[PDB]
Every structure is written in structure tokens, then in C-alpha cells.
A paper describes a structure:
SARS-CoV-2 is an enveloped, positive-stranded RNA virus that enters a host cell by fusing its lipid bilayer with the target cell membrane. S1 contains four domains: NTD (N-terminal domain), RBD (receptor-binding domain), and two CTDs (C-terminal domains), protecting the central helical bundle structure of the prefusion S2.
The Delta variant (also known as lineage B.1.617.2) was first detected in India and was quickly characterized as a VOC and has since outcompeted other variants to become a globally dominant strain within several months. The Delta spike protein fused membranes more efficiently at low levels of the cellular receptor ACE2, and its pseudotyped viruses infected target cells substantially more rapidly than all other variants tested, possibly at least partly accounting for its heightened transmissibility. SDS-PAGE analysis showed that the Delta trimer peak primarily contained the cleaved S1-S2 complex with a cleavage level very similar to that of the G614 and Beta S proteins, indicating that P681R has little effect on the furin cleavage. For the Delta and Kappa variants, the FPPR and 630 loop configurations are largely consistent with the distribution in the G614 trimer; all are structured in the RBD-down conformation, whereas only one FPPR and 630-loop pair is ordered in the one-RBD-up conformations. There are no major structural rearrangements in the Delta RBD with two mutations, L452R and T478K. Neither binding nor neutralization of the Delta variant by most anti-RBD antibodies tested here have changed, suggesting that the two residues are also not in any major neutralizing epitopes. No obvious structural alterations were observed from the D950N substitution in HR1 (heptad repeat 1) of S2, with multiple pairs of charged residues in the vicinity that could stabilize the packing between S2 protomers in the prefusion conformation.
Residue numbers in the entry:
A (entry chain B): 924 to 1162
B (entry chain C): 730 to 836, 848 to 1068
C (entry chain C): 1118 to 1162
D (entry chain B): 689 to 729
The structure:
Amino acid sequence: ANQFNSAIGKIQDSLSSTASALGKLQNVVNQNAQALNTLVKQLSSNFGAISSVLNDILSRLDKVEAEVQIDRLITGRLQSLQTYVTQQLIRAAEIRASANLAATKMSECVLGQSKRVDFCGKGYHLMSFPQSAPHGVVFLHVTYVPAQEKNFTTAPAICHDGKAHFPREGVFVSNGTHWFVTQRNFYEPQIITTDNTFVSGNCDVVIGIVNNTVYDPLQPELDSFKEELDKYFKNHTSP
Amino acid sequence: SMTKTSVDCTMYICGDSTECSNLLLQYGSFCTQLNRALTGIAVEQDKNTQEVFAQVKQIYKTPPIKDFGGFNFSQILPDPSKPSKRSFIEDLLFNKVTLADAGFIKQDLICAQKFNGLTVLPPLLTDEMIAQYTSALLAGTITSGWTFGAGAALQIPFAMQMAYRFNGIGVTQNVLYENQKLIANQFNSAIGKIQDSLSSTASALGKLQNVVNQNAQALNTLVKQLSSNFGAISSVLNDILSRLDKVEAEVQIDRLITGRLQSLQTYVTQQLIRAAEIRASANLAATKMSECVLGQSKRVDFCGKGYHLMSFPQSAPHGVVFLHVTYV
Amino acid sequence: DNTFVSGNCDVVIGIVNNTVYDPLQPELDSFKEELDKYFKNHTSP
Amino acid sequence: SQSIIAYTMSLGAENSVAYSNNSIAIPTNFTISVTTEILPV
Ligand SMILES: *[C@@H]1O[C@H](CO)[C@@H](O[C@@H]2O[C@H](CO)[C@@H](O[C@H]3O[C@H](CO)[C@@H](O)[C@H](O)[C@@H]3O)[C@H](O)[C@H]2NC(C)=O)[C@H](O)[C@H]1NC(C)=O
Ligand SMILES: *[C@@H]1O[C@H](CO)[C@@H](O[C@@H]2O[C@H](CO)[C@@H](O[C@H]3O[C@H](CO)[C@@H](O)[C@H](O)[C@@H]3O)[C@H](O)[C@H]2NC(C)=O)[C@H](O)[C@H]1NC(C)=O
Ligand SMILES: *[C@@H]1O[C@H](CO)[C@@H](O[C@@H]2O[C@H](CO)[C@@H](O[C@H]3O[C@H](CO)[C@@H](O)[C@H](O)[C@@H]3O)[C@H](O)[C@H]2NC(C)=O)[C@H](O)[C@H]1NC(C)=O
Ligand SMILES: *[C@@H]1O[C@H](CO[C@@H]2O[C@@H](C)[C@@H](O)[C@@H](O)[C@@H]2O)[C@@H](O[C@@H]2O[C@H](CO)[C@@H](O)[C@H](O)[C@H]2NC(C)=O)[C@H](O)[C@H]1NC(C)=O
Ligand SMILES: *[C@@H]1O[C@H](CO)[C@@H](O[C@@H]2O[C@H](CO)[C@@H](O)[C@H](O)[C@H]2NC(C)=O)[C@H](O)[C@H]1NC(C)=O
Ligand SMILES: *[C@@H]1O[C@H](CO)[C@@H](O[C@@H]2O[C@H](CO)[C@@H](O)[C@H](O)[C@H]2NC(C)=O)[C@H](O)[C@H]1NC(C)=O
Ligand SMILES: *[C@@H]1O[C@H](CO)[C@@H](O[C@@H]2O[C@H](CO)[C@@H](O)[C@H](O)[C@H]2NC(C)=O)[C@H](O)[C@H]1NC(C)=O
Ligand SMILES: *[C@@H]1O[C@H](CO)[C@@H](O[C@@H]2O[C@H](CO)[C@@H](O)[C@H](O)[C@H]2NC(C)=O)[C@H](O)[C@H]1NC(C)=O
Ligand SMILES: *[C@@H]1O[C@H](CO)[C@@H](O)[C@H](O)[C@H]1NC(C)=O
Ligand SMILES: *[C@@H]1O[C@H](CO)[C@@H](O)[C@H](O)[C@H]1NC(C)=O
Ligand SMILES: *[C@@H]1O[C@H](CO)[C@@H](O)[C@H](O)[C@H]1NC(C)=O
Ligand SMILES: *[C@@H]1O[C@H](CO)[C@@H](O)[C@H](O)[C@H]1NC(C)=O
């Protein structure tokens, strides 16, 4: 909780401190603004007509002169709209793709948890929170990241009474003197038992298998229950 | 990615003519807008190449002692002896795509384009640098499995990684242990069949070659359109300026400006639409790098056919090749 | 150890009979033979 | 004494992995990290 609360704090301080982070959304707002200004500036171009101003043709020339100049402006202007609409269709295909990706991340990172590596932030995905933005979406992805590692010696399987043993989930590790079993994404060691492991085959076939005793949690529960019983027989010498 | 192209709209429309340049200013921003459009394409090639390969901010390296449980990655890991540090399968890939201009200086269709104000810009990352990022991805995969994706790289024995994989497809981890020689032999033999395929057939890289062939075909078409008359007394600009005075030359040059400018709008539209095809493919390859290379995917047929185990990236001319490993 | 129980034999379509082994069983019944010979021997003194 | 340098870029820190046929690293601890990601819609 403290790491989460502090990380949400670092988002506030990041979005306060840095200029560039929204640079995707800002670039989309700039692209449509610049395109609209390009479309209006293209009205001032002559296209070879005696002026770009429509009335300076209509006054300073006769009808069959003027029609030849006005048709230059109509041609050039129409090509300017066809260019803007082609740029906007191609642009809209990128924003669509980005919206279908955002709708996919809303579906998979916000409404769910993702086993797709690096799809919902970097690290193992826990959850994500959406935030609205001008013409966009921002996700705060929350991820679990492995931090302080230790090396350990490990083995493919363990041998006991001549059978091989393997973890049910997790992996075997040794600190150098004792073998343990532990979950593959966080170090929490346990005494190796028949409840942590399962059995398959004799000890010869597994490349790299070592020797280490396996504990049976049923056994001292029967063996103390032999001494209780053993105590009975001693009592039964006396009556 | 695809070849970055820069065209100078003025040098293409108006080859060294002041008259044509003064007439071209009657159109205004049309010339600049078409350079802005091609620059947006040229910049997102380096973005697409970053998204796909620069997935790790650390360059992992394989150990010198190749004890990977019997799995023989020597044909997909780097070669020390070759002048560029690409793998054996990556050298086949670089021989099996053909390029129209790499952009690396001049001192023939490459020449005809350059003589007409058309230029190919080099990629940011060299083919050595993509080989190095590929080495990092593959060495992280062999030595560390998915863990170098999720954070710092954690070592794990390769046969122990393959065990975690097997549990990942719902096959119990002793099915690897009890068969490790067979599984390593099948893998080694399948890496062998990749070479005996690619070494002998021409068509296998066809997706990359078709992308190069279109950018070549379109630059050839934009070179050819300078031979169109568009109704002017010549296709050649100087022959108009030589035979006519200003009062008649302006009428002829105005035709050629109109026709060449419509030809550039066609090229830049075709290239922007094509550039969307490549960006969709780069986003697919970056996603396949994230989900098939840096991980294991439970998404059926997303990482090759069969139950996915792991995958290895390879650099290729303007592309990526994924060697997907699957349990069938 | 390989199987889990839920409900009774009437409800499941296509269910079949077989024995289901329990690994605690001979591990206790061997501990009955280990006991029986001790009771028989403790008649002898 | 500041000036524009030009250089061949490095792709990251060089880092050989501690690999061995019987060595594993396991995380004794973890960090929760929050990352912003932004998409146009
Ligand atoms: C590998 O991990 C082992 C488990 O933590 C560890 O063994 C344990 O070592 C401690 C001492 O450091 C022992 O603690 C007991 O020591 C005496 C016993 O009379 C008492 O005075 C103490 O109060 C305490 O009960 C544990 O008994 C011992 N556990 C086992 C299973 O032997 C190893 O030391 C670790 N090895 C390395 C190389 O770090
Ligand atoms: C792990 O524990 C195993 C059981 O103790 C051990 O197996 C034993 O290994 C020795 C040495 O190879 C064998 O010794 C006998 O070898 C032949 C017969 O095979 C005889 O000519 C010799 O005189 C000697 O009696 C044991 O027979 C063998 N035990 C079994 C059940 O096969 C492994 O070697 C141990 N491995 C490690 C890494 O400690
Ligand atoms: C699977 O094994 C079952 C256990 O042996 C067996 O169930 C038994 O089926 C018979 C015949 O239907 C029943 O016989 C009794 O049925 C009623 C009382 O419920 C009486 O009217 C009859 O005279 C007779 O006593 C058994 O009661 C029943 N046992 C149990 C515990 O339910 C199944 O028939 C076997 N099925 C197959 C397909 O193998
Ligand atoms: C995990 O261990 C490796 C090296 O293996 C160890 O080498 C011995 C000295 C001893 O510690 C044995 O138990 C191991 O077999 C560590 O890699 C070394 O890291 C240091 C910097 O910290 C560097 O100077 C060395 O050159 C590295 N050696 C190699 C071969 O890479 C590794 O850092 C250890 N992991 C952690 C989390 O500390
Ligand atoms: C991994 O596979 C390669 C290719 O088969 C092996 O390299 C060959 O090794 C033999 C024996 O030394 C040589 O005769 C060949 O000329 C080598 N070919 C190449 C391409 O180098 C390599 O030895 C195998 N690795 C292991 C550990 O067996
Ligand atoms: C740049 O141009 C010069 C020529 O002006 C090239 O220099 C020649 O290089 C060749 C090959 O090494 C030599 O045989 C000649 O003797 C050089 N000539 C001169 C005048 O020096 C130079 O190679 C070119 N560099 C690039 C990268 O294109
Ligand atoms: C599983 O199939 C493999 C082939 O993929 C079998 O391995 C082959 O076995 C024959 C003898 O039966 C050998 O001649 C081949 O050289 C083996 N091939 C390899 C790649 O090693 C294997 O026998 C089958 N396993 C089982 C349990 O049926
Ligand atoms: C796991 O790492 C966290 C930090 O990421 C450790 O928490 C800090 O512990 C130090 C003392 O060792 C305190 O001064 C800090 O205030 C702690 N920070 C937080 C957020 O609580 C934590 O001790 C580590 N846990 C283990 C088991 O090593
Ligand atoms: C592991 O490698 C060492 C050499 O570094 C070797 O002595 C040992 O036999 C190998 N063990 C296995 C299980 O491969
Ligand atoms: C011995 O067994 C008798 C019953 O036969 C019981 O009353 C007595 O408390 C037992 N004493 C001990 C020490 O077990
Ligand atoms: C399977 O269905 C057939 C009828 O199509 C039936 O006769 C048979 O007993 C059924 N067997 C099982 C195991 O359900
Ligand atoms: C019988 O019981 C005695 C203890 O009273 C013991 O010494 C002996 O070994 C036992 N014999 C057998 C065959 O159980």
C-alpha cells in the first residue's frame, strides 16, 4: 500500500515537473490545428490567377477573361480541400488504430488482468486505472516488479528412497547447506515435503538430479503414535 | 520499416529553373506540405525500428561456456568471426532480400533517382545495431527466460526454463526431464531444417521483398513521370525555356508544374497509405517481440502453430524474423 | 491424491464405477500387522 | 567549454548474465511501480 500510494504521488510530481509526457495528445492537437491553418493559408495562393482575391478578378477583367482566371482559383482550391481531406482520412486511420488499441487496453488492463507480457505497463500486470484526457485516454498501469534478488544453487529434481521428486509449483533451491522449495517469482523457502512435490521414475534418467531427503508429514504423526502405542504395551507389563 | 525517402518538391518539379520556381510559388504551401508528409514517414521508420528491437535498455550477453542442457543455439547466437556480428541464420536472411539503394553515400536505377532530386535517407540504427539488440533479446531469452521482461534479468538453467514452459502449456515438468535428450535433439534438428529451407528456396522472405519492391517501383514511377508532356510542347523543361520567351514559356511551364505536382501528391499519398501498412506491421512485430520473445503466450496460433514454448528474434533487411518454438 | 469429490453417484451423466485407492490405507494396515504380531508375542512371556 | 559532440550511439550498458547449469536468481522483495501510458482516442 505504501509503495502504491508513493508511486501515485510520483505520477502527480512527474506530470507537474516534465513538459513532454502528453506529447502524443499534444502532437494530435497540433496536427489538426496546423492542417486547418494550412488549408486557410492556401486561399491566398494565386494558382497563376492575376490575384487570389476573387473580386480583383471579377472587376479588373471581362467575363471570358475572368472565367479563365476564376477557374484557376476553383481548380487550386478544390485540390486544397482534396488534399486536406486525404490528409484527414489518413490521419483518422491512425487515431482509429489508436482508439481500437485503447479500447483493447480498457478491456484487458482495466476490466481484467493481463498475462500478455509488457502489454499493460512493464513488469507483471496487477491492475490499471483509466483517466480522461483531451481527445485521449491515460492509463495508470500498476505492475509488480521483482527487486532484490539472491543467487541460489538449484536442481531439476530431488532423489530420496530411489525415486525422483519434482515441485508441484515453484522450484528447488539450496542456500549451500540445505535444500528448500520456493515459488518461482518470490523467495519464500519451505522444507521439502511430499505435499510440496510429486513423484515420477527412478533416479537415473534426470540430468542434474541431486540427493536430498524429503519429509513426509504423515510419518512423525504415525511414529509418535507408535510411542503412544509403545507406552500402552509398557503399561500392559504391569496389570 | 521501409526505406526513408526525401524528395525536394522544388528540385523535382523545377530542375534548376528560376522561372519554374517563381511559377511554383503561385501554389504556396503545396511544396512544403509534401515534404512535411514524407518527413513524418521518414521519422516513424526509426520509431518503428525502435518499437520492435529496442525493447531492452540493457545489452545482455551469453556466457563463453555454452552449457544450455544440450540445446545448441550456435546457429542463432552471434558469430564472433564475421565482420558484422550477425548469426548464421541472420546472414542467410541478409543474402535473401535485394535492395534499391541503401543510402550509404555515392562517389543504374539508384543513379537515375539521385539525378532527379529523389534521395534515400539511411536508417538511424545500423544493421550492426539491430544485430546487437537481437543478441540482447536472444541472450536474455536463453539465459533468463521471461524474467528479463518483467524486471532485472534473473539467471535460470536452460533446461529449467524449458520446464517452466512445459508447465505453461499444461504438460507436467517431468515430461521434459525424462525426455531432455530427445527434446534437445528435436530442437537442434528443427534449427537445422530452418537453414535447409532458407538456403535453398527463393520465396521464403517474400513479405520483406515485396515491401522493398513497392518503394522501388514507386520511385521508378516518379522518375518516369518527368517524361510526360502533360500537353506542353516538351517533356523537358530546358527545351521549353530555350525555345520560348517568358510570355509563351509561362503557359507551357504552368502545364508541367501542374502535372508534376499532381504526380508528387500521388506518390506521397501512396507512400502515406503504404506507411500505415508498415506501422501496423511494426506494431504487430513489437507485440510479437513483447508476447512471444520476452514471454510465453497462451494465445492460440499467435506465436506460430502449436502450443507455444518460446521464440527467438532475428534481424532481417527492413524486417524481423521470429523463430517460434512450439510443442505439437 | 489425484482426484477430488463432489456430490453422489446419481447426478453425473455417464459416470462409471472403479475402485479409488487411498495411500493412507496400507500405510495404516501395515501398522496393524506391526501391532498384531506384538499382541501375539506379548501372550508368550 | 560546452560544444556539440557527435558519436556512435551505445545501445545500453553491457551486461553478461550470471548463467550456469545449476544457478538461479530469485527475488526476495519486489516494488509496486505505476507507469503512465497515453493513447489518442
Ligand atoms: C540454510 O538455511 C537453514 C535454515 O534457516 C540454516 O540452518 C539453520 O541455522 C540456524 C542457526 O543459524 C539454526 O537455529 C538453531 O540453532 C541452535 C540449535 O540448537 C539454537 O541455539 C537456535 O536458537 C536455533 O534453534 C537452525 O536449527 C538451522 N536449521 C536447520 C534445518 O538446520 C542454514 O544455516 C543456512 N545455511 C547457510 C549456508 O546460510
Ligand atoms: C546418491 O545416493 C545414491 C544411493 O546411496 C548413490 O548410489 C550409490 O552409488 C555408489 C557408487 O556408485 C554405489 O556403490 C556400489 O557400486 C557397485 C554396484 O553398483 C559396487 O561394485 C561397489 O562395490 C559399491 O557397492 C551404490 O550401489 C549406489 N546405490 C544404488 C542404490 O545404486 C549415488 O551415487 C549418490 N549420488 C551422489 C551425487 O551422491
Ligand atoms: C456401480 O456400482 C454400484 C455399487 O455396487 C451399483 O449400485 C447398486 O445398484 C443396484 C442395482 O440397481 C442396487 O440394488 C438395490 O436397489 C434397491 C435399493 O436401493 C432394491 O430395491 C434392490 O432390491 C437392491 O437391493 C444397489 O443398492 C446399488 N448400490 C448402491 C450403493 O447404490 C451400480 O449398479 C453399478 N453400476 C454400474 C453401471 O456398474
Ligand atoms: C551471482 O553470482 C555471480 C558470480 O558467481 C559467483 O562467483 C563467486 C565469487 C561466488 O560468489 C559464487 O557464490 C558464485 O558462483 C555474480 O556476478 C559477479 O558480480 C560482480 C559485481 O557484483 C562482478 O564483479 C563479477 O565479475 C561477476 N561475475 C560474473 C562471472 O559475472 C552476481 O552478481 C551474483 N548475483 C548477485 C545478485 O549478487
Ligand atoms: C552445435 O551445432 C554445430 C553445427 O552442427 C556444431 O558445429 C560443428 O562441430 C563439428 C565438430 O567439431 C565440426 O566438424 C563442424 O564443422 C561444426 N560446424 C559449424 C557450423 O561450426 C557444434 O559443435 C554443436 N555444438 C555442440 C555442443 O555439439
Ligand atoms: C569522398 O570523395 C573522395 C574523392 O574526391 C574519395 O577519395 C578517393 O578514395 C579512393 C578509395 O579509397 C582512393 O583510391 C582515391 O585515391 C581517393 N581520391 C582522393 C582524391 O583522395 C573518398 O573515398 C570519398 N569518400 C566517401 C566516403 O565517399
Ligand atoms: C517419440 O517420437 C520420437 C521421434 O520424434 C521417437 O524418437 C526416435 O526413436 C527412434 C527409435 O524408435 C530412433 O531411431 C530415432 O533416432 C528417434 N529420434 C530422435 C529425434 O531421437 C521416440 O522413440 C518416441 N518416444 C516414445 C516414448 O514413443
Ligand atoms: C523491500 O524493499 C523495500 C523498499 O523498496 C523496503 O522498505 C523500506 O525499508 C527501509 C528499512 O530497511 C525503510 O527505511 C523504508 O522506509 C522502507 N520503505 C517502505 C516503502 O516501507 C523493505 O524493507 C524491503 N523488504 C525486505 C523483506 O527486504
Ligand atoms: C555443470 O557444469 C560443470 C562445469 O562448470 C560440470 O562440472 C557439471 O558436470 C555440470 N553439471 C550438469 C548437471 O550439467
Ligand atoms: C495404565 O493403564 C490403566 C488402565 O488399564 C490406567 O488406569 C493407568 O492410568 C495407566 N497408567 C499409565 C502410566 O499409563
Ligand atoms: C453413449 O451413447 C449411446 C447412444 O448413442 C449409448 O447406447 C451408450 O450407452 C452411451 N455410452 C456412454 C458411456 O455414455
Ligand atoms: C517379543 O517381546 C519382547 C519384549 O517383551 C521382545 O524382546 C522380542 O523381540 C519380541 N519378539 C517378537 C518376535 O516380536
